[PDB]
Symmetry: C5
Subunit: 335 residues, 5 copies
Amino acid sequence: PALLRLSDHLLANYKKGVRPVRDWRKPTTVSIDVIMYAILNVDEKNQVLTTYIWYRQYWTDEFLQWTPEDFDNVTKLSIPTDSIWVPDILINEFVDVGKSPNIPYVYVHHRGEVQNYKPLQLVTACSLDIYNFPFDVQNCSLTFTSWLHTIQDINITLWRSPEEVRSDKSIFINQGEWELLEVFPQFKEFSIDISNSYAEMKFYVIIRRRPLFYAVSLLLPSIFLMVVDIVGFCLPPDSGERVSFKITLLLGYSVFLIIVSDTLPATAIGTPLIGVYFVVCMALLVISLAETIFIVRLVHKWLRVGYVLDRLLFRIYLLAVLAYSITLVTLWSIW
Amino acid sequence: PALLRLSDHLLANYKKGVRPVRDWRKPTTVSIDVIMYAILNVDEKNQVLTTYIWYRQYWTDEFLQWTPEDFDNVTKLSIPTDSIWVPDILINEFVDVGKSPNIPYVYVHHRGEVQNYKPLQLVTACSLDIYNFPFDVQNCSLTFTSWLHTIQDINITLWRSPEEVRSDKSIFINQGEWELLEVFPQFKEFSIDISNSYAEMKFYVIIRRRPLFYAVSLLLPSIFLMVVDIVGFCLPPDSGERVSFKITLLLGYSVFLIIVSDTLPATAIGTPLIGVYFVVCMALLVISLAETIFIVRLVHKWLRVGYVLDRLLFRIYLLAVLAYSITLVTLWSIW
Amino acid sequence: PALLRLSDHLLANYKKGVRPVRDWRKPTTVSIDVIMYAILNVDEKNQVLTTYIWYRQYWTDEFLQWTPEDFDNVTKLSIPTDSIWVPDILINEFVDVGKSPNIPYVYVHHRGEVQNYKPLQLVTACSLDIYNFPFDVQNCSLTFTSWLHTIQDINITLWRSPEEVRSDKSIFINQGEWELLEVFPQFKEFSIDISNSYAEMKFYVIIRRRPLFYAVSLLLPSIFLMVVDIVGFCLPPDSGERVSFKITLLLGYSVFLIIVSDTLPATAIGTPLIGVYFVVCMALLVISLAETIFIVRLVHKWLRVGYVLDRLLFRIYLLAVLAYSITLVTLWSIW
Amino acid sequence: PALLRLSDHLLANYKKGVRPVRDWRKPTTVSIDVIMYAILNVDEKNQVLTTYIWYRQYWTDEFLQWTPEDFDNVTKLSIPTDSIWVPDILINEFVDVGKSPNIPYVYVHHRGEVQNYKPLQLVTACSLDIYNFPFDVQNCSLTFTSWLHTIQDINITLWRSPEEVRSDKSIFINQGEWELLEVFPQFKEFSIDISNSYAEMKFYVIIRRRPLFYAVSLLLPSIFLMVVDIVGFCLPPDSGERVSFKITLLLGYSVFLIIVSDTLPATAIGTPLIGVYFVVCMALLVISLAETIFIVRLVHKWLRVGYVLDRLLFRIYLLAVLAYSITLVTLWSIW
Amino acid sequence: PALLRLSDHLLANYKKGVRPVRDWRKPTTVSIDVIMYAILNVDEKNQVLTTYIWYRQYWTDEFLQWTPEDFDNVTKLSIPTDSIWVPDILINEFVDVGKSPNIPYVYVHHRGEVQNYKPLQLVTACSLDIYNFPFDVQNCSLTFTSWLHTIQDINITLWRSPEEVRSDKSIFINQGEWELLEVFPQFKEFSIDISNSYAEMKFYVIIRRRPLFYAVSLLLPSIFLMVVDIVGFCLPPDSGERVSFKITLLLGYSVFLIIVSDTLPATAIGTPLIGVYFVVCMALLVISLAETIFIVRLVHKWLRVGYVLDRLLFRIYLLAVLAYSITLVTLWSIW
Ligand SMILES: *[C@@H]1O[C@H](CO)[C@@H](O[C@@H]2O[C@H](CO)[C@@H](O)[C@H](O)[C@H]2NC(C)=O)[C@H](O)[C@H]1NC(C)=O
Ligand SMILES: *[C@@H]1O[C@H](CO)[C@@H](O[C@@H]2O[C@H](CO)[C@@H](O)[C@H](O)[C@H]2NC(C)=O)[C@H](O)[C@H]1NC(C)=O
Ligand SMILES: *[C@@H]1O[C@H](CO)[C@@H](O[C@@H]2O[C@H](CO)[C@@H](O)[C@H](O)[C@H]2NC(C)=O)[C@H](O)[C@H]1NC(C)=O
Ligand SMILES: *[C@@H]1O[C@H](CO)[C@@H](O[C@@H]2O[C@H](CO)[C@@H](O)[C@H](O)[C@H]2NC(C)=O)[C@H](O)[C@H]1NC(C)=O
Ligand SMILES: *[C@@H]1O[C@H](CO)[C@@H](O[C@@H]2O[C@H](CO)[C@@H](O)[C@H](O)[C@H]2NC(C)=O)[C@H](O)[C@H]1NC(C)=O
Ligand SMILES: *[C@@H]1O[C@H](CO)[C@@H](O[C@@H]2O[C@H](CO)[C@@H](O)[C@H](O)[C@H]2NC(C)=O)[C@H](O)[C@H]1NC(C)=O
Ligand SMILES: *[C@@H]1O[C@H](CO)[C@@H](O[C@@H]2O[C@H](CO)[C@@H](O)[C@H](O)[C@H]2NC(C)=O)[C@H](O)[C@H]1NC(C)=O
Ligand SMILES: *[C@@H]1O[C@H](CO)[C@@H](O[C@@H]2O[C@H](CO)[C@@H](O)[C@H](O)[C@H]2NC(C)=O)[C@H](O)[C@H]1NC(C)=O
Ligand SMILES: *[C@@H]1O[C@H](CO)[C@@H](O[C@@H]2O[C@H](CO)[C@@H](O)[C@H](O)[C@H]2NC(C)=O)[C@H](O)[C@H]1NC(C)=O
Ligand SMILES: *[C@@H]1O[C@H](CO)[C@@H](O[C@@H]2O[C@H](CO)[C@@H](O)[C@H](O)[C@H]2NC(C)=O)[C@H](O)[C@H]1NC(C)=O
Ligand SMILES: *[C@@H]1O[C@H](CO)[C@@H](O)[C@H](O)[C@H]1NC(C)=O
Ligand SMILES: *[C@@H]1O[C@H](CO)[C@@H](O)[C@H](O)[C@H]1NC(C)=O
Ligand SMILES: NCCc1c[nH]c2ccc(O)cc12
Ligand SMILES: NCCc1c[nH]c2ccc(O)cc12
Ligand SMILES: NCCc1c[nH]c2ccc(O)cc12
Ligand SMILES: NCCc1c[nH]c2ccc(O)cc12
Ligand SMILES: NCCc1c[nH]c2ccc(O)cc12
């Protein structure tokens, strides 16, 4: 038989507990890429990101060299992973890797270029930016890293040209939640201390959100919670039922932030700009409640003057709303 | 003894780390099917699907051949799985496979047709369609795939005739949530790059929802949240308590979308058509609030004219509702 | 030494990868029972059931036979499980078995009757009936099944007499949520196809719910949400504040179904009969809102006639409530 | 070298698959205790308890005997656990043990007293009592049990004197949620059937709750939801806005039980006595709504008589509240 | 070949089940540090903390000594972890360690200084302080501990100088939720009993919260839920709609504590001081409801006296609010 004659010749004395090389000064350079498949979920409140990545490796292993002659011209061959060496690479930003299944097999070639594929899901922790919530651009980081070995032992480089990883839209699942512009690779040499230096190669993946689901469901409710009191201002502020017309909005609007405030994270770089806007709309409707109650103490045992000291309060409204159409377009002109 | 004499003769030198064949140019074709048992849950918000599938395999292994003579006419035999080869197939759309228990045993035959059964549950990620929410048809995808090996090494085909998989309603658990029409198999040859080609065989499973639980509980509440203001229009719009009759609906209806908007996913192909309808019913009741407040500024220190400029607003209502009975029947005429 | 002399004599050549028998035509019949300990949780919405079962097995293994002579009259002996054979039985309705800990040891006897105990928890999927929610009887199914082996290889039977399993209330944890009447065993011969036949033995476990927690907390609130408007009918329907008395109930009652509708599953055999009753109480209070608003358009610039066309609406109420005391007693006469 | 000369002499022929003894009639008595560290969580609704326990064992293993002479006076020694025997003990009330990490090592002595430590967390299921909710005493049960072996094989006893386990407050984490009085050990001999008998040793751990967080946050809101209508009774019941003053409490108080009713379990031994009290306060405020509406039908085209038939309704209030100060003190006199 | 000649010479007889030393009286001192990377989440209600720590070890193993001569001057070498000894250290405050992936490899040197790196995530249980909620300082504890071995077997010490661990801000992820001042190491000698003594070395990590997300979203709503009734006091308390103006705040403010009370833990050292303040603001607004209802029974078939007995109630308000600006600044002067 031809094929298992090779494995008997090859793995007869392959001690798997050795980083395999003939000359130990040379670092066995592993070499990878990523092909990002899908973005599963971005829970902003938990400060984590789950990502499904197809993944590839090769590295030069000299102990696994044969000749295609004397084995009937076999140049590719399958080997169980735990019967050979594997590099100790993993990611500096994981939370739980127990969701990736173990691919049992690898390829090898007659030069010793052992080739490994596996998928890997990472609930990964990168500090997401929540500045402009319905139009956010995300700059997330995957730093694939030798956890133990140093620059003398292994070094990291890329499989292909870095421009090819950049616009790789070969496989992706759109019509989900997100959509990415590009995947940015960049080497970095890491050294936390003296006399130590660790091979790292980052991946600045960047994604942006499709806003159209929030367009009808989130800020279009923010439209007629802002137009309800403008036309709700038009009746003369001496009906008496103005305060029952108005305070039912006010604590009713407290649940609109506190649902969103428990949705959105505790990052102190800022409350989102969509979030700061309906708190400030609540910061200017409440002073109108003073104005509809000072008039009824005034009209008590200057009626035209209450109409015009409160008419200047109406100018406060469309000062804010006409300040708000520009902050959407100057976010619409970001993507 | 007869039976373990066979296993001693058979697995004496079976090196499990070799894709087993006599001639390595021939690809060892695995051959499967599915018998879909139940659909556990469809959480629309997480963009995932959990599915319980009974599952089958065989492939031709020449190293496990014997003769039924000299072993007392034994033609079937049980073998532990991790003592032989297994193909590396798994699914391109998983999230977590740690819910399937390991079936320890397989069959073999005297031709070498090793036969494997196992169940497998997949929390699987397929981009579900949320266009018509209470009557949706789902086109979900299971792509069973050699994760590592190529067309030279293994190829995928089907067990039985593809028409038999199509209407296979042998075992299924109805009276759950869903009900499927058919399971559609289709081969595809996959090749992401040059000089590589990977055996894939999809499964376009398609399911549709029984709407009868939402019939009483979801859109029948949408009936009398739409009939409440029609008869709530009939009193003459000068009672003064019209606005307290009406605004209590309006922000009260904001919680009806925002419960559903946090239930339903952020897919930007569309808000559901059932969901877009009670936002537009909210988009036309709010302009009536202008009409019940412009009349009370008009009636202030043309009364018949307020009755008829607002009567044309009543025509806006049954313009929308009679536009809504057709969009249910033209979804009732989809299934 | 006496005891480990036996294990050296017994497991010297016991190849564990063989279904152990001397004559392979004879099927090695396993033989089990269950002793149901507790019912952990019934989440109706997820269509699953978690159950803690004490569990037992034996089967005749001829290769493990010795004589009590030459071993100082030893008739029972402990063996590690993964050093012998085990049948491949598991349950057709699981969701996740990773909650059962591995019992490492088994018994054997001098006849070869290897005996195995283990506990097993199953989040199990059986189509629960939600017809009569506070008084439901549940007919759930546990089908213990050879996943791989057929009728020629193994067969399933019961340990004890089937009447003893029926009323087995030896160990159970009452004062929890549920309480079972009986556990019903029944053999079935399973054969999905031709030339194949698989040993199955079901367990129709049936449980019923103690209603007393819902008695005060669920349908006693349904009492005075139904008596609140009956006495709330008694004031004459021309107070003007009748609509503010009444519509605050109506959308306030919409949250009473939509909390329960997201609690209770999407099974289309029916909304529960307790659930269909307070939607129909909402279906008849809303037409009273028409009656309290048609009278105020009538009383506008026949007063005794509005009192009696609405008095017949009062007969609609106790037509429904006196139709409701019978549907509880005819559920109280089910258990 | 001295130390690994011992392990080579000791584990040369130690067949781990034998319950180790020289004479098999003698049962190898294991011997344990517990040192309860912390109580993590008590979710009442799931009927489970998570508990972090430090844990200890020893048992007499005669096969591991040596002499301190010829090994340089070594009397203690470390051994990997899976290279020796271990008893099969585990707990009858677990839900999931996959949270305890595997302690790899054990001690031994020159007498053969092998000593084992390990921590173990148990999400454990014991039928908790919910009678008096803010002052509850809990009688929970941990039954450490040989799952397989019988009285002939192993027996269970205690490490130390049972009075020392009783008041063991050496290590505990207070300022959490709970605080225990004592840990009560008690042997029991278990025998579910004939010809079988299983070594069990229970642990009646008992804990009680610190009520001070619920003191301000749970029943102090129950104070001014009961004083709000008493002073809300003082205005004369002919204001007309009494019903809008009152029904807004009533369905508003329905959400106060139904938040708590979905918090608290479905045990039918009783709704909690704190829970039964604000349902009965709701059972007596609703009949006052009849009294404030029968008077306005009376005062319609006996005014002093409506003041005094409703004054006797005021006596119903402080009949209930003065019946309620005693049920707190007679729970304050339980701890 | 040079490198695997070493591993064949080194691990030929290395029995891994021995704590490796030449003289057993000497304790093999392990030696560690921590480099705290990120704080993932602090769920106050579950009384747990999840922490991602980079982690380091070394210990002197004499059995792994070689000379750099005869191996081509190799001074560093990689070894699989489960092929050598490892100390049994783990943490006394874990909940679940199954989130840390297994680093397969370690270093060694020609002196025998075996060096080990691994990451480790701990959902860890330390009694967090909830006294001053938006400005809290946390004193959490990580006690790295030999679970089994004693002072004779292993001892714990630190890698580097303890001042270097103190201000180690080399790698940290800020712009998350938290920010730490320092990491405090301290040895402690632990001995729960007589004749036993266990090596422990604590880590008093201390973190404090950035308050700026709660600044706009949590206590700025607490501003205008306190200013709404102050200006809502200014109208004269005889409008009649004062009670409908006021009670709608009161039970509406009950949901503001009971959302937070189910957010915040059941620790009985105290309700938070931010939490005790809006319960006492609710404790003083409710007595104003008595004052707005005693006046309307007074004004019934002394009007200026109702204005001034209630004006002293206004002094109660800014007695509390001016007592509240100091308790923020005297928390602003804590960090
Ligand atoms: C994401 O953020 C990183 C910063 O960490 C950006 O990296 C910078 O990229 C520019 C462009 O090449 C360089 O000049 C800087 O030196 C980089 N800084 C660092 C610290 O790496 C990165 O560009 C951002 N992603 C995108 C898409 O802009
Ligand atoms: C480790 O790998 C990096 C690249 O992964 C090496 O950087 C290369 O350095 C050479 C010369 O020093 C340049 O010609 C290449 O263009 C560099 N590549 C990149 C991507 O920048 C680095 O030299 C390696 N170090 C060692 C010690 O092997
Ligand atoms: C689910 O969607 C796929 C599209 O991905 C449909 O597949 C098409 O099927 C038709 C009918 O045979 C072919 O003509 C097309 O070439 C297929 N396209 C692709 C991309 O596969 C599939 O039919 C859909 N499912 C159902 C039940 O209609
Ligand atoms: C891999 O398998 C597919 C089917 O699984 C093969 O497609 C078959 O091709 C032959 C001739 O090329 C046809 O007669 C069959 O009808 C095809 N089957 C189907 C289902 O379409 C394919 O040829 C195989 N390729 C290799 C290299 O083995
Ligand atoms: C649970 O449902 C099953 C139906 O699947 C019932 O099984 C039937 O039992 C009767 C009584 O022996 C038989 O006559 C039928 O042939 C059975 N049918 C099937 C399909 O098994 C079972 O009785 C139900 N449980 C209870 C307690 O009534
Ligand atoms: C497989 O087991 C079942 C029972 O588990 C066998 O059914 C028995 O059949 C015999 C005669 O055929 C009857 O006398 C018994 O009363 C049956 N038992 C029961 C519980 O019904 C069945 O025959 C077995 N089949 C094989 C091939 O062994
Ligand atoms: C917890 O409940 C058990 C009952 O299961 C109590 O056990 C009883 O204790 C008394 C006092 O020794 C004995 O006289 C009884 O015989 C015991 N009964 C059983 C069934 O064990 C136990 O005392 C309770 N815990 C506490 C602290 O009182
Ligand atoms: C099994 O262990 C229990 C204790 O764990 C034994 O009970 C002891 O019995 C002896 C005499 O029978 C008494 O002197 C002791 O005081 C008992 N101990 C306790 C704690 O009650 C029991 O006898 C043992 N049984 C066997 C067969 O070994
Ligand atoms: C966290 O709390 C511990 C108390 O457990 C503090 O430890 C004390 O520190 C002081 C300062 O060195 C010592 O004098 C005490 O003896 C320590 N007591 C104990 C019990 O260890 C620790 O200082 C606190 N953390 C911070 C940052 O203050
Ligand atoms: C165990 O280790 C601790 C330190 O980790 C030792 O404490 C040292 O003791 C010596 C003399 O007793 C002092 O010179 C050092 O300064 C101490 N170190 C520290 C950090 O305090 C302790 O002696 C060791 N014990 C044994 C038995 O080895
Ligand atoms: C192997 O390959 C070489 C070159 O491709 C060729 O000359 C030779 O004939 C081949 N031999 C076999 C057995 O295929
Ligand atoms: C085996 O099978 C063959 C053909 O089926 C038959 O001729 C022969 O007698 C059988 N032998 C035994 C021992 O069953
Ligand atoms: N069957 C797809 C195998 C495969 C093809 N190309 C790939 C790229 C990356 C990867 O992880 C895997 C793959
Ligand atoms: N006992 C059922 C075994 C079985 C019968 N037919 C099957 C089909 C598929 C499968 O995974 C399993 C099976
Ligand atoms: N210690 C209880 C062992 C045991 C006794 N009877 C049993 C019955 C079933 C079972 O799984 C286990 C048991
Ligand atoms: N380092 C603490 C080891 C330890 C000391 N005493 C203990 C008691 C029980 C236990 O599980 C463990 C221990
Ligand atoms: N590649 C980073 C390896 C590393 C460098 N310094 C470290 C410190 C601690 C640690 O666990 C790990 C490390």
